[PDB]
Write an enzyme that holds these catalytic residues in place. Structure first.
Site, PDB file in Angstrom:
ATOM      1  N   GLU A 117       0.845  -1.193   0.000  1.00 61.28           N
ATOM      2  CA  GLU A 117       0.000   0.000   0.000  1.00 61.28           C
ATOM      3  C   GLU A 117       0.877   1.239   0.000  1.00 61.28           C
ATOM      4  O   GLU A 117       1.069   1.892   1.032  1.00 61.28           O
ATOM      5  CB  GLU A 117      -0.958   0.001   1.191  1.00 61.28           C
ATOM      6  N   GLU A 174      -5.044  11.080   1.967  1.00 56.48           N
ATOM      7  CA  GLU A 174      -4.232  10.648   3.090  1.00 56.48           C
ATOM      8  C   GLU A 174      -4.091  11.784   4.105  1.00 56.48           C
ATOM      9  O   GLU A 174      -4.612  12.884   3.919  1.00 56.48           O
ATOM     10  CB  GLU A 174      -2.876  10.147   2.591  1.00 56.48           C
ATOM     11  N   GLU A 181      -3.658   7.872  -1.392  1.00 55.38           N
ATOM     12  CA  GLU A 181      -3.450   6.434  -1.315  1.00 55.38           C
ATOM     13  C   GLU A 181      -4.440   5.725  -2.222  1.00 55.38           C
ATOM     14  O   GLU A 181      -5.641   6.004  -2.173  1.00 55.38           O
ATOM     15  CB  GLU A 181      -3.609   5.923   0.117  1.00 55.38           C
ATOM     16  N   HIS A 230       3.765   0.024   3.520  1.00 51.79           N
ATOM     17  CA  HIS A 230       3.527  -1.143   4.363  1.00 51.79           C
ATOM     18  C   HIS A 230       3.435  -2.423   3.541  1.00 51.79           C
ATOM     19  O   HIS A 230       2.757  -2.474   2.513  1.00 51.79           O
ATOM     20  CB  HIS A 230       2.233  -0.961   5.158  1.00 51.79           C
ATOM     21  N   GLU A 318       2.160  -7.430   8.956  1.00 52.95           N
ATOM     22  CA  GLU A 318       2.375  -6.145   8.298  1.00 52.95           C
ATOM     23  C   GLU A 318       3.674  -5.531   8.800  1.00 52.95           C
ATOM     24  O   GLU A 318       3.781  -5.165   9.973  1.00 52.95           O
ATOM     25  CB  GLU A 318       1.193  -5.209   8.541  1.00 52.95           C
TER      26      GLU A 318
END
Lengths: 415, 415, 415
Positions: A117, A174, A181, A230, A318
């Site tokens: 992402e 964002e 994003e 991430h 993550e």
């Protein structure tokens, strides 16, 4: 896809040109455009480029990566770099990730998924076409128009990505002004890294079409939230997630715990690869939703590793320190190798922090920590490891000697 | 093509005008436009021009060079320059190359192929239409948009060339900012030189449509990589490459070795023809991927002669000192004669340099070396040799007396 | 002058500061200013400077060079450079000239006079104080105001030089626009070189007071006459000129002929020292009253050596290739050694040219000719010779790679 499939696609779609594109050690995508009359030469792995001009080689296209840019019609193929003897070049990050995955397959794991992402900023262009320092808007998290002025550009990016076969999950403004994003669903490791590479270029092209400049620089402005990439990772051994335990209340297998233990134990060592810029460590500062402490948690927002509450086939880990400027292939290979080291050494996991070492604070310190780690060297191979260290050392030495405007503002009138 | 073919083409394509174009000693393409109603006069070799205004002559079109410019529809024919007595003019570079090839055919060699690869810069135009010093982009080797801003112009050049019958092989951004390369496959010597001449004018015409200025100047800017026009040459005696030996592991015949020996031995002599500008020797400086040492190698990047690893019918010798400002006919004739000198004198080849004379450092030194070589004088003939030497001497005398801004920056305050 | 004389001068003139000034290898005058309270330290040869910052050393003032700048009152002393062991530094041009003169004295010659005549341009300053490219006027040879607008600045320079002990002979406008000449009579070799060094700084200081920039650059502008520093040379053995023959009709001794023979024979060797700039060889071009042919004459204007018609004690030999950018000490030592070589080898003189080798055309060729001459190496000593060659080679290498505006005007649209 086979050669016949590619030939059929070229005839029926009236493709006129082929872009053979690959990635260097810095994550920059490189390509050469070839008329479709050289399709047979391309499919026979006989295309040649210099190599000495990129940070006597051969291009071997990966046929599953065929896709047509919807903007003479051009299709592209992502190629691996081979030597003159038919063996893959040891300095190619994509071939490095493929052989790391091949070594993983000997441990019984048949798959490795990556859900990335990345986030990006949009800056306004001037009349000459150069980017300025003013963001496209002053919106916030989940903001809408006319406060979110990047809505049209973001919609066009999503529209173009959907034509290219992406599976888009969500798009939103964002936290930082001018920060956006777009989320797409996970894929296999190699195709996920290919997705990241294609996503960056699609975003930049469509942003240019909107008189905007898109940058994946981690921290372009001081006092403003930075951009992260991430990495959501999960291991599979055959149509089943190796991290999900349907028996315990927590729902995590011992394999998931050992993977986290390995990533935590080797986190200091791969920080330089996952945060390759000098600017990357201006994001790794407290107070801006960025991880800087090596810990894991299941119910918390800002440790280094976060395990989402979802379970079943969607059980993932993550890693939150990766920034969009990182090379996806090298960073993913490093994370996979750290997790596999934890798996095969049966490391015990530190207790989760719900309320502890520290990530390196500068690129120089991260390079120093990278030389002392044995797992990152095995993950990257000798060639990539040495070239990365040399280039980053030169870059730091260039940065170390500069005099910034901050220094002239604090001093030069006081001293 | 015959006269009937040209007449049929003119009627069926509705061609309105004919461009009879030829090349002077400096490589500049000259032309006169004629209405199609004079087609019979053109085909009867009765076209006349001045001659005293170009660095009482007749134009003899080469019918195989028929091609229509896809931008009143205009076709063109490349013509040889003849005198009033029906014999070719001794100062015409194209007829010079034709007779050098005729002399080569007496040695048993039936063909001589040339694969060139010129490079060019793109500069932005101002409002008045004059070129500025600002490059179109700041991209690098194998860079892509939006870092490579010459993508659309390069694509339109390739599209325009393909309509004209070129076989384009590759197109990519070059090492220097604003530097681009479009590759087309080899052809016979005369038609390869015609391809170079046509390629330069097509590039320069299509660049203007994009509000850009295309230049083939060797070194337009200091501190930036220059442009080269590497010559790939191979000899044939009947549908078979004379340089390829499918017995030896290296795979090169004795003929290929003697050709290299001759080119190396006469390399000092033809440098002025292959590097005809004062600017040409600002490119021949160390540290910028340009050849400055007279040596050959099979596995190395920057000797004067590079023998590519490919074998079979594609066995070639790459002379790397030719710059795009050279006259293709004169440079190719000089290289062919230098190689044939080694062929007919059975010269032994120096050992390849895998880790040595020097090319002339200035245009004056290259002219001095050109006056001391018999092979270049035999290759160019007396007329072209004398006119080239006189014009280049005058040009050097003009350059020698100028006071540059560098001199006024180093001095004028220090002294 | 003695120490007591200097102390008396400091007390009676109320001198507050002392400038200890010396010359580096490039001819640039370097100095440090010292309060008069350190007069005893200065006179004890205990002053120290770095040396590594100039192209652990001690300054030894030459007391005969005492003079007060008429513009806290400042006086100056010209110092020799000594090492820590009390011996003169071998890389000091002034001490080099002193020891060359000492060696000459062993041949019976007791004196060596030099009459120089440097020329300079005047350029207008802008509002920021930087020199522009426009000359102060557009006058010609022997022109007067308002055509000669440098009359007041030249008069102020003459007035300031006369207060400093110069014996000014003439001042007039020179051939080129904005070019001026002020003449002062000959002196001994060391004090004549000191006069040149002082003259340059006085001219540059006074021109600044008139909002003008004075430069001794040989050829500041193209198409315009350059500046020369003709060296008038005569040898003496005791209150009598060794060049004057009162019996021969021409009036020149055999010593005068041998000196000319030696200078002509070694002229190619010392050209680099006498013409040390890249710009120096833009002046050495035909058609601008500058010497470029190695010959001598008694009745002619532009050979390399001119023997003026005056006889008696003023019988001299004029070397015309020296430009005002040369180091006076090194050039004078080179010329003296070249003449003494002919004196001690009894060289025969070529016939005078009243209506022939060639001077080097560039700094690179002059450096090449410098390495092949033993007399210049003997004249300069080893240290100065090597340092000069290395620095000039680096300067030529820097100049060689530049792309001038002339190249972009001739090319970049033609190619």
């Amino acid at each position: 896809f086979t050669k016949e499939d590619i030939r059929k696609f070229a005839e029926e779609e009236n493709v006129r040109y082929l872009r053979l594109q690959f990635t260097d050690i810095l994550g920059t995508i490189k390509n050469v455009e070839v008329p479709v009359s050289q399709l047979e030469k391309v499919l026979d792995n006989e295309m040649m480029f210099d190599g000495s001009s990129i940070e006597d080689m051969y291009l071997h296209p990966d046929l599953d990566t065929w896709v047509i840019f919807p903007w003479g019609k051009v299709a592209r193929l992502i190629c691996d770099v081979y030597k003159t003897d038919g063996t893959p070049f040891e300095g190619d990050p994509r071939a490095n990730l493929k052989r790391v995955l091949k070594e993983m397959e000997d441990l019984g794991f048949t798959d490795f998924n990556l859900g990335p992402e990345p986030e990006f900023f949009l800056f306004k262009l001037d009349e000459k076409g150069e980017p300025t320092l003013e963001l496209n808007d002053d919106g916030g998290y989940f903001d809408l128009a006319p406060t979110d002025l990047g809505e049209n550009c973001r919609r066009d990016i999503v529209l173009e990505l959907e034509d290219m076969g992406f599976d888009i999950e969500a798009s939103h403004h964002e936290v930082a002004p001018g920060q956006h994003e777009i989320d797409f669903k996970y894929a296999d490791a190699v195709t996920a890294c290919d997705n990241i590479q294609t996503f960056k270029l699609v975003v930049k092209t469509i942003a240019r079409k909107h008189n905007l400049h898109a940058t994946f620089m981690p921290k372009p402005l001081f006092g403003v939230n930075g951009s992260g990439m991430h990495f959501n990772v999960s291991l599979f051994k055959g149509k089943e997630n190796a991290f999900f335990d349907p028996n315990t209340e927590m729902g995590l297998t011992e394999t998931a715990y050992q993977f986290t233990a390995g990533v935590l134990k080797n986190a200091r060592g791969f920080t330089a690869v996952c945060n390759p810029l000098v600017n990357s460590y201006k994001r790794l500062v407290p107070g801006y939703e960025a991880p800087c402490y090596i810990a894991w948690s299941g119910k918390n927002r800002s440790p280094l590793i976060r395990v989402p509450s979802s379970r079943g086939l969607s059980t993932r880990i993550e890693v939150r320190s990766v920034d969009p400027a990182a090379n996806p292939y090298m960073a993913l290979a490093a994370i996979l190798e750290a997790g596999l080291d934890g798996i095969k050494n049966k490391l015990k996991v530190p207790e989760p922090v719900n309320q502890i070492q520290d990530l390196p604070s500068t690129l120089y310190t991260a390079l120093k920590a990278m030389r002392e780690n044995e797992v990152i060297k095995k993950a990257l191979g000798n060639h990539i490891y040495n070239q990365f260290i040399n280039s980053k050392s030169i870059e730091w030495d260039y940065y170390r000697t500069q005099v910034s405007e901050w220094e002239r503002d604090q001093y030069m009138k006081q001293y």
